[PDB]
Nucleic acid binder design. Structure first.
Ligand SMILES: [Mg+2]
Ligand SMILES: [Mg+2]
Ligand SMILES: [Mg+2]
Ligand SMILES: [Mg+2]
Ligand SMILES: [Mg+2]
Ligand SMILES: [Mg+2]
Ligand SMILES: [Mg+2]
Ligand SMILES: [Mg+2]
Ligand SMILES: [Mg+2]
Ligand SMILES: [Mg+2]
Ligand SMILES: [Mg+2]
Ligand SMILES: [Mg+2]
Ligand SMILES: [Mg+2]
Ligand SMILES: [Mg+2]
Ligand SMILES: [Mg+2]
Ligand SMILES: [Mg+2]
Ligand SMILES: [Mg+2]
Ligand SMILES: [Mg+2]
Ligand SMILES: [Mg+2]
Ligand SMILES: [Mg+2]
Ligand SMILES: [Mg+2]
Ligand SMILES: [Mg+2]
Ligand SMILES: [Mg+2]
Ligand SMILES: [Mg+2]
Ligand SMILES: [Mg+2]
Ligand SMILES: [Mg+2]
Ligand SMILES: [Mg+2]
Ligand SMILES: [Mg+2]
Ligand SMILES: [Mg+2]
Ligand SMILES: [Mg+2]
Ligand SMILES: [Mg+2]
Ligand SMILES: [Mg+2]
Ligand SMILES: [Mg+2]
Ligand SMILES: [Mg+2]
Ligand SMILES: [Mg+2]
Ligand SMILES: [Mg+2]
Ligand SMILES: [Mg+2]
Ligand SMILES: [Mg+2]
Ligand SMILES: [Mg+2]
Ligand SMILES: [Mg+2]
Ligand SMILES: [Mg+2]
Ligand SMILES: [Mg+2]
Ligand SMILES: [Mg+2]
Ligand SMILES: [Mg+2]
Ligand SMILES: [Mg+2]
Ligand SMILES: [Mg+2]
Ligand SMILES: [Mg+2]
Ligand SMILES: [Mg+2]
Ligand SMILES: [Mg+2]
Ligand SMILES: [Mg+2]
Ligand SMILES: [Mg+2]
Ligand SMILES: [Mg+2]
Ligand SMILES: [Mg+2]
Ligand SMILES: [Mg+2]
Ligand SMILES: [Mg+2]
Ligand SMILES: [Mg+2]
Ligand SMILES: [Mg+2]
Ligand SMILES: [Mg+2]
Ligand SMILES: [Mg+2]
Ligand SMILES: [Mg+2]
Ligand SMILES: [Mg+2]
Ligand SMILES: [Mg+2]
Ligand SMILES: [Mg+2]
Ligand SMILES: [Mg+2]
Ligand SMILES: [Mg+2]
Ligand SMILES: [Mg+2]
Ligand SMILES: [Mg+2]
Ligand SMILES: [Mg+2]
Ligand SMILES: [Mg+2]
Ligand SMILES: [Mg+2]
Ligand SMILES: [Mg+2]
Ligand SMILES: [Mg+2]
Ligand SMILES: [Mg+2]
Ligand SMILES: [Mg+2]
Ligand SMILES: [Mg+2]
Ligand SMILES: [Mg+2]
Ligand SMILES: [Mg+2]
Ligand SMILES: [Mg+2]
Ligand SMILES: [Mg+2]
Ligand SMILES: [Mg+2]
Ligand SMILES: [Mg+2]
Ligand SMILES: [Mg+2]
Ligand SMILES: [Mg+2]
Ligand SMILES: [Mg+2]
Ligand SMILES: [Mg+2]
Ligand SMILES: [Mg+2]
Ligand SMILES: [Mg+2]
Ligand SMILES: [Mg+2]
Ligand SMILES: [Mg+2]
Ligand SMILES: [Mg+2]
Ligand SMILES: [Mg+2]
Ligand SMILES: [Mg+2]
Ligand SMILES: [Mg+2]
Ligand SMILES: [Mg+2]
Ligand SMILES: [Mg+2]
Ligand SMILES: [Mg+2]
Ligand SMILES: [Mg+2]
Ligand SMILES: [Mg+2]
Ligand SMILES: [Mg+2]
Ligand SMILES: [Mg+2]
Ligand SMILES: [Mg+2]
Ligand SMILES: [Mg+2]
Ligand SMILES: [Mg+2]
Ligand SMILES: [Mg+2]
Ligand SMILES: [Mg+2]
Ligand SMILES: [Mg+2]
Ligand SMILES: [Mg+2]
Ligand SMILES: [Mg+2]
Ligand SMILES: [Mg+2]
Ligand SMILES: [Mg+2]
Ligand SMILES: [Mg+2]
Ligand SMILES: [Mg+2]
Ligand SMILES: [Mg+2]
Ligand SMILES: [Mg+2]
Ligand SMILES: [Mg+2]
Ligand SMILES: [Mg+2]
Ligand SMILES: [Mg+2]
Ligand SMILES: [Mg+2]
Ligand SMILES: [Mg+2]
Ligand SMILES: [Mg+2]
Ligand SMILES: [Mg+2]
Ligand SMILES: [Mg+2]
Ligand SMILES: [Mg+2]
Ligand SMILES: [Mg+2]
Ligand SMILES: [Mg+2]
Ligand SMILES: [Mg+2]
Ligand SMILES: [Mg+2]
Ligand SMILES: [Mg+2]
Ligand SMILES: [Mg+2]
Ligand SMILES: [Mg+2]
Ligand SMILES: [Mg+2]
Ligand SMILES: [Mg+2]
Ligand SMILES: [Mg+2]
Ligand SMILES: [Mg+2]
Ligand SMILES: [Mg+2]
Ligand SMILES: [Mg+2]
Ligand SMILES: [Mg+2]
Ligand SMILES: [Mg+2]
Ligand SMILES: [Mg+2]
Ligand SMILES: [Mg+2]
Ligand SMILES: [Mg+2]
Ligand SMILES: [Mg+2]
Ligand SMILES: [Mg+2]
Ligand SMILES: [Mg+2]
Ligand SMILES: [Mg+2]
Ligand SMILES: [Mg+2]
Ligand SMILES: [Mg+2]
Ligand SMILES: [Mg+2]
Ligand SMILES: [Mg+2]
Ligand SMILES: [Mg+2]
Ligand SMILES: [Mg+2]
Ligand SMILES: [Mg+2]
Ligand SMILES: [Mg+2]
Ligand SMILES: [Mg+2]
Ligand SMILES: [Mg+2]
Ligand SMILES: [Mg+2]
Ligand SMILES: [Mg+2]
Lengths: 45, 272
RNA sequence: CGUGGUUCGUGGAGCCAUGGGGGAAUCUGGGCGGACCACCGCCUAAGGCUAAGUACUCCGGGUGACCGAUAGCGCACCAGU
RNA sequence: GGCGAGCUAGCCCUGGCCAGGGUGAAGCUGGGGUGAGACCCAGUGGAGGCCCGAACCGGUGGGGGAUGCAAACCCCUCGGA
RNA sequence: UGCGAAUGCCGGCAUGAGUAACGAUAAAGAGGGUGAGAAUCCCUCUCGCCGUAAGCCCAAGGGUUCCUACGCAAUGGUCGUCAGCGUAGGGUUAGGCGGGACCUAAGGUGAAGCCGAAAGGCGUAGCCGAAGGGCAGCCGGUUAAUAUUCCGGCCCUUCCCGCAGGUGCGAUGGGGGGACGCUCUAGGCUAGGGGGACCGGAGCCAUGGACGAGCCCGGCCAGAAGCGCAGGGUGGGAGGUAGGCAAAUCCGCCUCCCAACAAGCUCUGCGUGGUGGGGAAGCCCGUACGGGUGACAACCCCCCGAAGCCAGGGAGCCAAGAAAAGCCUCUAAGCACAACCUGCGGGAACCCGUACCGCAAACCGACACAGGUGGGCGGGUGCAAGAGCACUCAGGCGCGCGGGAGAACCCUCGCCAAGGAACUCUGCAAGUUGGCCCCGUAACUUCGGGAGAAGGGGUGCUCCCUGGGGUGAUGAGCCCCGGGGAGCCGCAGUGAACAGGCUCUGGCGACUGUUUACCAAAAACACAGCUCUCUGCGAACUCGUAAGAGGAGGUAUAGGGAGCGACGCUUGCCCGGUGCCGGAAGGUCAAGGGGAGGGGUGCAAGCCCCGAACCGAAGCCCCGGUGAACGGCGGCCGUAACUAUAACGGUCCUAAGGUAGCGAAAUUCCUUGUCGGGUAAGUUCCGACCUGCACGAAAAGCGUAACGACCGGAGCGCUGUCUCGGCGAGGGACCCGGUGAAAUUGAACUGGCCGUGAAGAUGCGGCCUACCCGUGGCAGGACGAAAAGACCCCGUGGAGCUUUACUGC
RNA sequence: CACCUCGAUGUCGGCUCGUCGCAUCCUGGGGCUGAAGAAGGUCCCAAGGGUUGGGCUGUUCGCCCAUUAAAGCGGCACGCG
RNA sequence: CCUACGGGCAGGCGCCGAGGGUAGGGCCCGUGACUGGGGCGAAGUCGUAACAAGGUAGCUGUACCGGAAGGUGCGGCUG
RNA sequence: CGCGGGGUGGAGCAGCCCGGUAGCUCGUCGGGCUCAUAACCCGAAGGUCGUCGGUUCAAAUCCGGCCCCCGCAACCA
């Protein structure tokens, strides 16, 4: 039946995007985290 | 005066629709003075703050004129009486000789051809607005201001009226639709007559769907709930309140008075 | 009056700070020595600056009765893959 | 302390869809009726959380499936339309 | 620092096992080719399957999967020479298509402003924000692979400059406009489709007949101006003006004068059109696809006809149906040697996307997964219609293991003698019924219903006669509704496919609806409707620390909370307790005021502590009201001229002792109460009695037509449900080739009985029986597998819930 | 009673298939009788084989209808998921 | 088959048709657990409604209430 | 079996707690008013306190056994 993943390019940027991460202070932290750890990707592609 | 239906379908049996003979040749309710986009939404920034609302026919806002001193002396002719989905009442469209058009909430018996006017002058005839103080004790009236220049706020629902039982000092005594006795400043513009479309009280939606077109979503009794979400909720095959009847938020809903006591408004009230 | 800080949890409860109310004085003036008074002493509030000794290790070096690829950092290897 | 309404629930803005059948409300016109009416009868008309029934939305009973085709499926039957 | 256990951790390898399975039962067969190797790749022919699709286009998403050469280790459930796989090279062409240098929507963001310990929150203008609004390209050809993008033909927009002609030009400002619902619907067209004796075409005469008005095949597409046909839009002139936050000559309003018509003007649609281009069968070629010919192809008449176009068309209705820009007009500063408008002409025209898959092997589901996924097109014949059903065109497929065999058993189907619910918890299941036309149809009812009630008859084909309509000329043709008559055939004419079994009677809920995504669809929720109660508007109420916001741009015919639940007849008594409402007195009580008096230290002045009376709120007490507020609504004894029984009486208690109605009930313990009814026989069912363990009136009482995938009873019809089984079919099971799992597993050389043993022994005792090893089957046992029992207890273990538990906010 | 089993010994009835016991329901053989015959009563022997179809209820059981030679009682984890 | 054949009879088919069957209606009668009132019946219970202001003038139509007669409300009659 | 209450003149109740008193209403009996009855008024009688013990100076009362009557409870399984 209908599963949980209905990919939508716009939703994914609008939600987990870089510009999205940067507004909420909690989001900046996510980035600050993924950098510290050295994530090759700070954000979904 | 409230149209009936034959029972050619259930719910059509006891159902009842408004009578629209007072609706002068009218359909597209003239832009300019209204309509106006009406932002219909059932809650505030985020959360629902008024329960069981939503859906319902999309509707254009009719920007009506609730202060008439705006046009002292300048009379106007009654051009039309039309449907407004934003109030129980009907709105009269009146052309001024100024060339300006605006809607007014249609008084009862107001014919489509009358000259209307507002001001200390103003003949005491149905449709004319006047500062209360200059209105003969005993006359009924509607669309009353509560404080000078703040715009009419009383008796605007279909059929609602208000009598001026007397005067005292800068104020006049009004008997409101509620039956309350209120001192109101004499300088407050009222407009002689009683609202209108008063058969409005006797319509019968008839079906569930009808209540929805009006944008009223289903209402569920606490009783039907669990204890998590309402004071009455749980205990097997239902069971009497089991406490003094209360709102989902805990407060009692039978009799408990809720008006703030220290309200300054208090010293100008005198009834039910 | 209401609270915090101090070992001090209302305790005989000072001292320091202060949300609220009232509200001074300028050397013979003020604060303090654990309720309060006296005596005796200590110090000059309601402005500010001040290196060094002190803390830490992304980083560099030196050592090891530290590990030796299931150990040792998650990664000795194109691993935060 | 953060991450989630790309599943699901509600609401908001803006678009889209519902084969074809049937029943025949008001109103209208004509005839009758009366002091005038009510009302009656035809014809017309085409209302309805109206009827039958695909799409579409469902999940009623049963059978199968049970390391499945499937971490909710398949067939027959059934509800709304 | 020593391992054998921790349902231990990581890793390796076993067992089950050559076992189950190899993923829809739409289906295959042969020939030829290639190759080391072929059921599996290429080609041909034959067969089968989709065809409102299993064909075709678009949007998401995916991201080289596209085309070609070479290749087969692995991925492919077998094979593989093939592939969506490995390597390499190629491939995505736009002023007009989509999106951006346009507009606004919800929402977001946000100068001003407001609020918040910090983080931050709100927020007017503005800005961002589209599948909505605006806006100029149609058709053919070409590539292995792109094309409205290249080419070809015809056509068009904007920007810049110039020339001419015209005018007060000028806007972020004003106004008109854009501009809007649902249902039904007129006329005229179009896509689309059928027919044709007419036009064009390779061929064909078979097997008994046919050389024929034979058969088979095709008879179009795009297209400016102009012109026609249909439709939408729209008044003209003058005067006054105080309104449209400046100004308008525009709009609004008033008077007057002319058309009220679409006449005029204007826009769109359709037709015709220069021109451009396509163009079947069949046959020939060689494919892995296509290509030549057929061709100088022909290219025409008739009919059926949209849900689409003219579009803002018309009518009815109530629930009363976005915005902004482009656009037009008006003026403002400003400029008017400007500027703008019309026509022509030259020049200029940017960024991103474009391959391929897209109902699926390329998207979401760990998989080449029987699931999920939005919009458009979706032909023909027939069946009353239709997107239904059957067959079929175009196109696409036979679903990536096969070959044999003909057991049990299972699944999915077909039929069955006699009987016909005897089956069972229950007709579960399955059968019967079944479309259309006509005849006919009850109680009851809210007059609509109940109704497809029930129950019946007709249904094919042939010939003859005959009526009406649409299109044409009134005529033929063609298309459509029929009407009457005489006959033919079968077991049977909706001859296949899709297509209600019916009636009677109770319970609950009025009704359509909603719900435990994945064990409950219901008598539960919701529902119109009744009642209570709160709220006078900066309303009550809700969210938030706040600002603020919803309520509502609403105003008591309104909004919030609560119960009840269409409708009908109704809803009694108790205010003592709890709640709520009223009560300016009195009683009590906090801070505070107040200070009579007491005390600590000083020689003193003083300084500093305590602290009575007294004036000090709400609340509580107290005093009343209140029942669709929380709630409640008696016990014993006696009594009538047979007997029973008790209208009547006595007494105790209470705040008051249950009224109407209903009652063995979704409630009745005793209980299969008792009587009647149904049955040969009735624990259930219907009617009734009342002895109501333990009904009762808005947690409503009693009824009620209609409605129900609810639940109970009865009958008719019909049946494999059954007596009671039998046969048959296909898919597995079996055998052969290929691939090849899983839970589980202390180790095994693993029998019966009677005993014993931690009380249920393959494993101990005694006896009995038994050569070693497999295969197809059955499930009694291994206290068989699975899950550290959900029940039960225990833990001074958790958590959700409640209140007159405690203590807080 | 609390002995194995709570790191699971599925718990009533039905259906299917049975197998055993005898304390025998029927048939076979008997003694006694208040056994005339016929039919019975009662105890003894005997487990070969047999022991019906229906209505009510989930029922086991029980009641009832119609029969019958008879409509037997128990055990087998109240036999057997 | 018979003729005195362009005939008759037999025989065949068809309409109608007694009645039989299936289905659904109507009217009437009998009967039924139980149930409503009614009539009648030498000496039952309870009360006092009416007749005399019947000890609350009576009666009345309606409505509510009550062991019972009744009471009360609203209006009407005078008998 | 469990738990709680009750038993007192003829009827229905109080007196039991807290030891010594037996009380209220009705009924019954005699007397009045009445033609008579009821109502009404004046008087009166009647109880060992369910039984058996126990405690105490003394028991309806406090205690235990039993006999009765009424009510409640019987849940997970
Ligand atoms: Mg996932
Ligand atoms: Mg993923
Ligand atoms: Mg998108
Ligand atoms: Mg920062
Ligand atoms: Mg890198
Ligand atoms: Mg509700
Ligand atoms: Mg609930
Ligand atoms: Mg919650
Ligand atoms: Mg609660
Ligand atoms: Mg409750
Ligand atoms: Mg209950
Ligand atoms: Mg303490
Ligand atoms: Mg201070
Ligand atoms: Mg000093
Ligand atoms: Mg000090
Ligand atoms: Mg000291
Ligand atoms: Mg000091
Ligand atoms: Mg200082
Ligand atoms: Mg200093
Ligand atoms: Mg420093
Ligand atoms: Mg280092
Ligand atoms: Mg070492
Ligand atoms: Mg290693
Ligand atoms: Mg390592
Ligand atoms: Mg490091
Ligand atoms: Mg590691
Ligand atoms: Mg690396
Ligand atoms: Mg969502
Ligand atoms: Mg419907
Ligand atoms: Mg229906
Ligand atoms: Mg339907
Ligand atoms: Mg469609
Ligand atoms: Mg199902
Ligand atoms: Mg279900
Ligand atoms: Mg199912
Ligand atoms: Mg199932
Ligand atoms: Mg059906
Ligand atoms: Mg259906
Ligand atoms: Mg080991
Ligand atoms: Mg060990
Ligand atoms: Mg390895
Ligand atoms: Mg095996
Ligand atoms: Mg096998
Ligand atoms: Mg196999
Ligand atoms: Mg496909
Ligand atoms: Mg690749
Ligand atoms: Mg190749
Ligand atoms: Mg390979
Ligand atoms: Mg392979
Ligand atoms: Mg596979
Ligand atoms: Mg390819
Ligand atoms: Mg490749
Ligand atoms: Mg495109
Ligand atoms: Mg530019
Ligand atoms: Mg914008
Ligand atoms: Mg913000
Ligand atoms: Mg924009
Ligand atoms: Mg658009
Ligand atoms: Mg465009
Ligand atoms: Mg093309
Ligand atoms: Mg292509
Ligand atoms: Mg055409
Ligand atoms: Mg055509
Ligand atoms: Mg030729
Ligand atoms: Mg021939
Ligand atoms: Mg010829
Ligand atoms: Mg043709
Ligand atoms: Mg005009
Ligand atoms: Mg054209
Ligand atoms: Mg043209
Ligand atoms: Mg040509
Ligand atoms: Mg081919
Ligand atoms: Mg229109
Ligand atoms: Mg703008
Ligand atoms: Mg101009
Ligand atoms: Mg392309
Ligand atoms: Mg393409
Ligand atoms: Mg594919
Ligand atoms: Mg495609
Ligand atoms: Mg599709
Ligand atoms: Mg996939
Ligand atoms: Mg596959
Ligand atoms: Mg698939
Ligand atoms: Mg779906
Ligand atoms: Mg036919
Ligand atoms: Mg059909
Ligand atoms: Mg089909
Ligand atoms: Mg087919
Ligand atoms: Mg084909
Ligand atoms: Mg397959
Ligand atoms: Mg049969
Ligand atoms: Mg038969
Ligand atoms: Mg039969
Ligand atoms: Mg039966
Ligand atoms: Mg049976
Ligand atoms: Mg069935
Ligand atoms: Mg069928
Ligand atoms: Mg019925
Ligand atoms: Mg035929
Ligand atoms: Mg004709
Ligand atoms: Mg049907
Ligand atoms: Mg049906
Ligand atoms: Mg219902
Ligand atoms: Mg659902
Ligand atoms: Mg469910
Ligand atoms: Mg507001
Ligand atoms: Mg608002
Ligand atoms: Mg309810
Ligand atoms: Mg009540
Ligand atoms: Mg009370
Ligand atoms: Mg009271
Ligand atoms: Mg009270
Ligand atoms: Mg009280
Ligand atoms: Mg007698
Ligand atoms: Mg009961
Ligand atoms: Mg009988
Ligand atoms: Mg039952
Ligand atoms: Mg009761
Ligand atoms: Mg009840
Ligand atoms: Mg109630
Ligand atoms: Mg109810
Ligand atoms: Mg009922
Ligand atoms: Mg329903
Ligand atoms: Mg149902
Ligand atoms: Mg069978
Ligand atoms: Mg063996
Ligand atoms: Mg043993
Ligand atoms: Mg031994
Ligand atoms: Mg042994
Ligand atoms: Mg074996
Ligand atoms: Mg076994
Ligand atoms: Mg088996
Ligand atoms: Mg086990
Ligand atoms: Mg455990
Ligand atoms: Mg605890
Ligand atoms: Mg034990
Ligand atoms: Mg023990
Ligand atoms: Mg075990
Ligand atoms: Mg024996
Ligand atoms: Mg039964
Ligand atoms: Mg047995
Ligand atoms: Mg037992
Ligand atoms: Mg058992
Ligand atoms: Mg089982
Ligand atoms: Mg009788
Ligand atoms: Mg009687
Ligand atoms: Mg009387
Ligand atoms: Mg009397
Ligand atoms: Mg009287
Ligand atoms: Mg009484
Ligand atoms: Mg009366
Ligand atoms: Mg009277
Ligand atoms: Mg007594
Ligand atoms: Mg006495
Ligand atoms: Mg006496
Ligand atoms: Mg004694
Ligand atoms: Mg419990």
């Amino acid at each position: 039946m209908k599963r949980t993943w209905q990919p939508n390019r716009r939703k994914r940027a609008k939600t987990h995007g870089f510009r999205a991460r940067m507004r909420t202070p909690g989001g900046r932290k996510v980035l600050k985290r993924r950098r510290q750890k050295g994530r090759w990707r700070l954000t979904p592609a | 005066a409230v149209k009936k239906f034959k029972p050619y379908t259930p719910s059509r049996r006891f159902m009842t629709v408004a009578d629209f003979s007072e609706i002068t040749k009218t359909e597209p309710e003239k832009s300019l003075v209204k309509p106006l986009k009406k932002t219909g939404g059932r809650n505030n920034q985020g959360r629902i703050t008024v329960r069981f609302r939503g859906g319902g026919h999309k509707r254009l806002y009719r920007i009506i004129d609730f202060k008439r001193w705006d046009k002292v002396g300048i009379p106007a002719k009654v051009a039309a009486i039309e449907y407004d989905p934003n109030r129980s009442a009907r709105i009269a469209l009146l052309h001024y000789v100024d060339g300006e058009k605006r809607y007014i909430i249609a008084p009862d018996g107001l014919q489509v051809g009358q000259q209307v006017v507002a001001g200390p002058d103003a003949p005491i005839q149905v449709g004319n607005a006047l500062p209360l103080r200059f209105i003969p004790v005993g006359t009924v009236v509607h669309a009353v201001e509560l404080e000078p220049k703040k715009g009419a706020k009383l008796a605007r629902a279909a059929g609602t009226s208000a009598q001026i039982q007397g005067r005292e000092g800068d104020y006049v005594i009004l008997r409101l639709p509620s039956g309350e006795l209120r001192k109101v400043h004499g300088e407050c513009y009222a407009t002689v007559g009683a609202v209108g479309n008063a058969d409005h009280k006797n319509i019968v939606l008839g079906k569930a769907g009808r209540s929805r077109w009006l944008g009223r979503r289903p209402h569920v009794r606490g009783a039907a709930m669990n204890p998590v979400d309402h004071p009455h909720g749980g205990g097997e095959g239902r069971a009497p309140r089991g406490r003094p009847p209360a709102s989902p938020w805990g407060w009692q809903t039978k009799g408990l008075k809720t008006r703030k006591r220290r309200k300054p408004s208090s010293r100008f009230i005198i009834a039910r």
